[PDB]
Ligand binder design. Structure first.
Ligand SMILES: *[C@@H]1O[C@H](CO)[C@@H](O[C@@H]2O[C@H](CO)[C@@H](O)[C@H](O)[C@H]2NC(C)=O)[C@H](O)[C@H]1NC(C)=O
Ligand SMILES: *[C@@H]1O[C@H](CO)[C@@H](O)[C@H](O)[C@H]1NC(C)=O
Ligand SMILES: *[C@@H]1O[C@H](CO)[C@@H](O)[C@H](O)[C@H]1NC(C)=O
Ligand SMILES: *[C@@H]1O[C@H](CO)[C@@H](O)[C@H](O)[C@H]1NC(C)=O
Ligand SMILES: *[C@@H]1O[C@H](CO)[C@@H](O)[C@H](O)[C@H]1NC(C)=O
Ligand SMILES: *[C@@H]1O[C@H](CO)[C@@H](O)[C@H](O)[C@H]1NC(C)=O
Ligand SMILES: *[C@@H]1O[C@H](CO)[C@@H](O)[C@H](O)[C@H]1NC(C)=O
Lengths: 99, 150, 127, 49, 50
């Protein structure tokens, strides 16, 4: 689609939101998820650190929090390596965005 | 021919609109069955915030729900630490997060400021005190042995 | 805007270069001509502040009616800025609550309509 | 009252709060209902859906 | 007549596709509101596993 359709009545009204504003929203959601927890989705937000956020999240699957503090270093390394793995797999995938 | 064409056009549009109203009705049914008849731990489903209950009302070709939600308002600062060491053994809070105002430490629940004194009933131990960062030297009163003189 | 409030209308030409609208063009005069990625806006002055969206236009430009009395277009305001002082040795806890109540409206069924085919297509003719 | 006392057990606050603030909670809920009534009473277009 | 028929065909197909995309968007909205803003005890909704 380049110009022939634009010259036969067929117009393309631009989207209401620009890409930058959507990026700003995603940045806001990430900021809330990192420095606040689930609080900011229910009114005013609360500031609370990150390690003692996973310390409570692990309380939500069936393992008590002392695991996280006793394996902080290993879990940090694992999460960072996982992010790197996402980055490289996305970097070297031909067709992963069919949907 | 022309009037017929109009007929299937109208019928098709009505069919589609029936599809959307079916989807909306199913959503409403799930809302009614998960909010009113119980309490749903999901968020942004039974109202905004921690939900309590609901009340339905009838209306021409529709329903109206009055979600009742609980929302904290005012906020206060405290100094935190995710562990406590007393006698060379770590301590963790049972169902609070360790907060303090500067000189005395307390444990509280996480949606209403309500401090209490920390004793063995409030904490459980795991290991020694060289395992994690954030350890804060403190004392835990024992409610069991000092009381009985005899 | 609402006819109750006023009667001043503004025109928008879709994806027509404001540098070429002289070819395109009481509103054809050049009074306050603004250029958006959605086209050329004629009949509304430009404002620099930030407000919530009232009538969408395109590319984030949102227009409103505020007073002397004319139409304005501006950058849509995502919301008031806020920041939170992250730090690893502090906690912020609520000390009072509020029981609020909000209304949700769901359609259920539409009007049960029926149609007579032969009557509507032929009336009362045997042919 | 001992139904809300259990419902608050379902969000993360122990029930003793409600029995210690029964009067205030009652007033707040009644005022909330009144607010719904008046906002519905004085709204031009709130039933578009 | 022919070009009209083409128009209604295209419009009908676009309407249907809008229906599927609406369903997908609603699903995504629920995913966003139940995963990101909290922790969902459901399985096979906020990822595979706990
Ligand atoms: C932190 O809170 C504690 C708990 O109330 C305070 O300790 C008591 O404070 C009151 C009044 O300030 C005194 O009458 C008591 O003697 C204190 N001790 C006990 C064991 O009750 C403490 O003062 C607060 N600190 C700050 C900086 O606000
Ligand atoms: C709470 O403490 C933070 C620093 O950790 C400070 O920036 C903030 O203003 C405080 N909140 C108040 C004083 O209400
Ligand atoms: C806590 O007290 C112990 C006493 O044996 C001391 O060895 C340790 O350094 C202290 N930790 C602090 C003050 O952070
Ligand atoms: C609009 O006019 C500007 C004049 O600077 C020109 O650079 C631009 O290419 C034009 N856009 C078109 C014709 O789409
Ligand atoms: C709005 O900002 C533009 C950008 O430079 C400026 O030219 C114009 O004078 C401003 N209008 C005001 C401040 O009313
Ligand atoms: C995080 O905690 C450590 C404790 O080891 C401290 O040294 C550091 O200053 C803290 N970060 C802050 C206060 O930003
Ligand atoms: C909590 O809010 C209610 C609502 O007005 C008020 O009456 C009460 O005094 C407040 N309690 C505080 C601020 O400690």
């Amino acid at each position: 689609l380049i110009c022939a359709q634009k010259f036969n009545g067929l117009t393309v009204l631009p989207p209401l939101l620009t890409d930058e504003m959507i990026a700003q929203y995603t940045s806001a959601l990430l900021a809330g998820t990192i420095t606040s927890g689930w609080t900011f989705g229910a009114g005013p937000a609360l500031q609370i650190p990150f390690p003692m956020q996973m310390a409570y999240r692990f309380n939500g699957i069936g393992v008590t929090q002392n695991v996280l503090y006793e394996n902080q270093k290993l879990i940090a390394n694992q999460f960072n390596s996982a992010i790197g793995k996402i980055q490289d797999s996305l970097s070297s995938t031909p067709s992963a965005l069919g949907k | 021919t022309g009037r017929l064409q109009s007929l299937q056009t109208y019928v098709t549009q009505q069919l589609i609109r029936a599809a959307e109203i079916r989807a909306s009705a199913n959503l409403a049914a799930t809302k009614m069955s998960e909010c009113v008849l119980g309490q749903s731990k999901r968020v942004d489903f039974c109202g905004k915030g921690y939900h309590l209950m609901s009340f339905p009302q009838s209306a021409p070709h529709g329903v109206v729900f009055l979600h009742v939600t609980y929302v904290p308002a005012q906020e206060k600062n405290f100094t935190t630490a995710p562990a406590i060491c007393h006698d060379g053994k770590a301590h963790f809070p049972r169902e609070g997060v360790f907060v303090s105002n500067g000189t005395h430490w307390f444990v509280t629940q996480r949606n209403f400021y309500e401090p209490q004194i920390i004793t063995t009933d409030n904490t459980f131990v795991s290991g020694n005190c060289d395992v994690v960062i954030g350890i804060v030297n403190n004392t835990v009163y024992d409610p069991l042995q000092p009381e009985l003189d005899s | 805007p609402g006819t109750n409030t006023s009667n001043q209308v503004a025109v928008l030409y879709q994806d027509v270069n404001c540098t070429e609208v002289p070819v395109a063009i009481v509103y054809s005069t050049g009074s306050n001509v603004f250029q958006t990625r959605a086209g050329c806006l004629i009949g509304a002055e430009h404002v620099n502040n930030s407000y919530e969206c009232d009538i969408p236009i395109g590319a984030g430009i949102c227009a409103s009616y505020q007073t002397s009395q004319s139409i304005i277009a501006y950058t849509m305001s995502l919301g008031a800025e806020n920041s939170v002082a992250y730090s690893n040795n502090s906690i912020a806890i609520p000390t009072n609550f509020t029981i609020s109540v909000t209304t949700e409206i769901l359609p259920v069924s539409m009007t049960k309509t029926s149609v007579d085919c032969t009557m509507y297509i032929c009336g009362d003719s045997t042919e």
